[PDB]
Structure formats: C-alpha cells, structure tokens
Amino acid sequence: YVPLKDQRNVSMRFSNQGPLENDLVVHVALIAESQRLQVFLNTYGIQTQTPQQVEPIQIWPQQELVKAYLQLGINEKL
Amino acid sequence: LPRASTSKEVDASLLSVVSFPAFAVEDSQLVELTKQEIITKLQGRYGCCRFLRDGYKTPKEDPNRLYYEPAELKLFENIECEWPLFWTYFILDGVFSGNAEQVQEYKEALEAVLIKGKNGVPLLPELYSVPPDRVDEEYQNPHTVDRVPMGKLPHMWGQSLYILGSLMAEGFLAPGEIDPLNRRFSTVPKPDVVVQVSILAETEEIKTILKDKGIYVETIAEVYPIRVQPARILSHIYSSLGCNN
C-alpha cells in the first residue's frame, strides 16, 4: 500500500513523470542491412550503419531468446 | 611527405604520424615508400636513430657546452647512438591493421635488447652509447661495434607503448575499442561527388536576356524565404563564436 504523495518512483506500477502524466521519450536504433543500401540512403542524406560495423555488438532474432528461456528451469530428479 | 623538413633528409618521427596515433595520410604507396626508406636508412643493430648527424650523448661535442659550433665535418658521422622507440612503434603498427609475422619478428628482435631490473620486470633503456675507445673502427665498419647503455632509463613513454602493444597482441582488447571514431579506415577510396549549381538573375532585364537564349532562371526576388549576401558578412558573423567577457 502506497499513499498518493509517495507514488512517484515506484517500479512496475507508476512512472517517474507522475500518475497523471505521460511524456515518455523512446530511443530507437537505426541499422542498415547492406552496404549498397547504406550508400544509397547516404546519397539522399539518410544515415544508416551496416551490420558489419557494430562488431562488439550482436544482433540476433527472436528465436534465440525463446530457446535460451526454454533452456531454463530444467530439473532431472523430478 | 617523403622528407620531414627542408633540412632533414629523413626523420624517424614520421612513423608516429603514419602509425597508431593520428592516422592522417593517403596514397598508401607513399606509406610503403616512407616505411621502406626509414627501414633502409635508419635501421641499426639494437635500434634506430632519430635522424642523420645528431650528436646527443657522444664522447665528443663537449656536453657541458651548447650552440654547436659549425665544425660538424665527421665528428658526428655514423655514431648516432640508438633509439628503441621507433622499434617499439613497429610492433604496434604491424599488429594494428593486418600484419602478424612482422609483429613476431619485431617482438623477437626487441626481447634481445631488453634489460632486467629489480623484481625481474621488463625495462626499456633510452639509448646505447658507443664506447669512447672503439671509434675509428666504426668509421670503417659501421654498425659492427657493440655499444653500452647510457643515460636515464625510466622511460615511461616507451614502456607504456610496449605494454599497450603487448596487451593488444594478447587479444584481450580489440582495435575497435581504442578508437571509437573509426580512424583506421582512411585508406578506403571515395568514388566521386555530384555538384549542384544554381543560377539567378540580378534584375528583370537579365532574366529576359537569359530566357531569350533558352535559359530559365529566377530573379533575386520571388524567393523571399531565401536570402543571399556576400561571404564577408558570414566571416563577420563567425567572428563572434566562443566569446567571453
């Protein structure tokens, strides 16, 4: 139980901006797919980055996360 | 590019410009040419010299006296001592882009010139000085007489560079982390660029004259949202950036 004055920075229930406020700013990441498409977009002023230039970072599909979660919670005795 | 200045034929300090720090160069053929020239001209036995005819730390020149007299006939010829910093730059330069065998060769060469001090840790000497007695032989047989260490050797610069190179070669760090700005791709060619040109008429008479010959332009008016002025106004405007009272 939380009073009305305290509900300002609670996790999973209320936002930092307050209960009667919704001004969230969402980040987006823009990544190209091919070098030819990247240079074609750059010719028009659109900036995109090839997947080969993010070597420290990795991009995976949604099936890998599903498989990893499926790996969790396995017990052999029962 | 080929010559460091108008007075020095070649300087080993050009390596730093054309290596790990501050990649600013094009026409990689020039890079190969200057590297080969440096290797052919300045390489020695335990290191390389900064430039030809330097008398630093010599059994001559009367070290307690400055302002070298114009008597450099042969008193500073083929007796430039050494500087392993250009050697420790080469391993990093090779390991950066794509070279591996050069890295092993330079590491093997550098391990022989090392001196072990307290607690048994690598230490890089500054330079090796020629013995004061065996000077005549070097004039007839250059790069043949053994040398001895001389001067200070808590060289933080060379030691730090060698440590960084060894750490990078060990594989713990990637070349893409040291430079986040991606300065290692300066040798990639750029194909071409298309240039756009706009034509305007100063008054109605000029527009009529150009439309007579088939050239369609617009006068200074009719583009009210857009204004044109000479560049001296732009310079005067730019003369106010970063001002503090």
In angstroms, the Cα distances linking B68 to B62, B151, B178 are 9, 20, 42
DSSP string, chain B: --SSSSS-S--TTHHHHTSSSS-----HHHHHHHHHHHHHHHB-SS-B-SSSS--TT-SSS-TT--S--S--SSTTSS----BTHHHHHHHHHHHHTT-SHHHHHHHHHHHHT-EE-TTS-EE--SEEEPPSSTTHHHHHSTT-S--EEES----HHHHHHHHHHHHHHTTSS-HHHH-TT--S-TTS-----------EESSHHHHHHHHHTT---EESSS-TT-----HHHHHHHHTTTT---
* C-alpha–C-alpha distance, residues A1 and A3, integer Å: 7
Interface contact B174-A53, CB threshold 8 A: no
| B79: nearest Cα among B24, B161, B134, B14 | B134
Q: Which of A54, A55, A57 to mutate to test the interface with B (most CBs of B within 10 A)?
A: A55
* C-alpha–C-alpha distance, residues B200 and B160, integer Å: 60
Q: Find out whether B118 and B191 touch, Cβ atoms under 8 Å.
A: no
Using the Cβ of B176 and the Cβ atoms of chain A, whether some distance falls under 8 Å is answered with yes
What number of other Cβ atoms are within 10 A of residue B56's Cβ? 15
Q: Find out whether B157 and B86 touch, Cβ atoms under 8 Å.
A: no
| B21: nearest Cα among B112, B104, B93, B101 | B93
Strand partners, B123: B115
Which string of b and e fits A31-69 if b means at least 16 CB within 10 Å?
A: ebeeeeebeeeeeeeeeeeeeeeeeeeeeeeeeeeeeee
Q: How far is A63 from chain B (nearest CA, A)?
A: 29
Which resolution in angstroms does this entry have? 3.4
Neighbour-count burial of B168, counting CB atoms closer than 10 A to its CB (0-12 exposed, 13-18 middle, 19+ buried): buried
* C-alpha–C-alpha distance, residues A73 and B200, integer Å: 74
User: What chain A residue is nearest to B177 in terms of C-alpha separation?
Assistant: A56
Interface contact B177-A53, CB threshold 8 A: no
List CB contacts of B132: < 8 A, sequence separation 6 or more: B59
Q: Find out whether B9 and B42 touch, Cβ atoms under 8 Å.
A: no
Amino acid at B192: D
Strand partners, B127: B150
* C-alpha–C-alpha distance, residues B15 and B161, integer Å: 14
Q: How far is A34 from chain B (nearest CA, A)?
A: 17
* Residues in B touching A57 (Cβ below 8 Å): none
Interface contact A56-B177, CB threshold 8 A: yes
Q: Find out whether B106 and B96 touch, Cβ atoms under 8 Å.
A: no
Q: Find out whether A39 and A24 touch, Cβ atoms under 8 Å.
A: no
* C-alpha–C-alpha distance, residues B147 and B58, integer Å: 12
In which residue are the tokens 């890295």 written? B103
Method by which this entry was solved: cryo-EM
Q: Find out whether B89 and B96 touch, Cβ atoms under 8 Å.
A: no
What number of other Cβ atoms are within 10 A of residue B91's Cβ? 24
* C-alpha–C-alpha distance, residues B100 and B113, integer Å: 21
* Residues in A touching B174 (Cβ below 8 Å): 55-56
In angstroms, the Cα distances linking B225 to A43, B95, B200, B220, B221 are 26, 55, 15, 11, 10
* C-alpha–C-alpha distance, residues B30 and B19, integer Å: 13
Using the Cβ of A56 and the Cβ atoms of chain B, whether some distance falls under 8 Å is answered with yes
Query: Residue B168's Cα: distance from chain center in Å?
Result: 20
* C-alpha–C-alpha distance, residues B56 and B61, integer Å: 9
User: What chain A residue is nearest to B174 in terms of C-alpha separation?
Assistant: A56
Strand partners, B201: B219
Phi, psi (degrees; rounded to nearest 5) at A4:
-65, -35
Amino acid at B222: E
* C-alpha–C-alpha distance, residues B42 and B15, integer Å: 12
Q: Classify strands B148-150 and B127-129 as parallel, antiparallel or unpaired.
A: antiparallel
Both tokens of A20, joined, read 């009667």
List CB contacts of A76: < 8 A, sequence separation 6 or more: none
Using the Cβ of B73 and the Cβ atoms of chain A, whether some distance falls under 8 Å is answered with no
In which residue are the tokens 């919670």 written? A73
Interface contact A53-B182, CB threshold 8 A: yes
Q: Classify strands B218-219 and B200-201 as parallel, antiparallel or unpaired.
A: parallel
Q: How far is A22 from chain B (nearest CA, A)?
A: 35
In which residue are the tokens 């070349």 written? B175
Q: How far is A54 from chain B (nearest CA, A)?
A: 9
Q: Find out whether B184 and B98 touch, Cβ atoms under 8 Å.
A: no
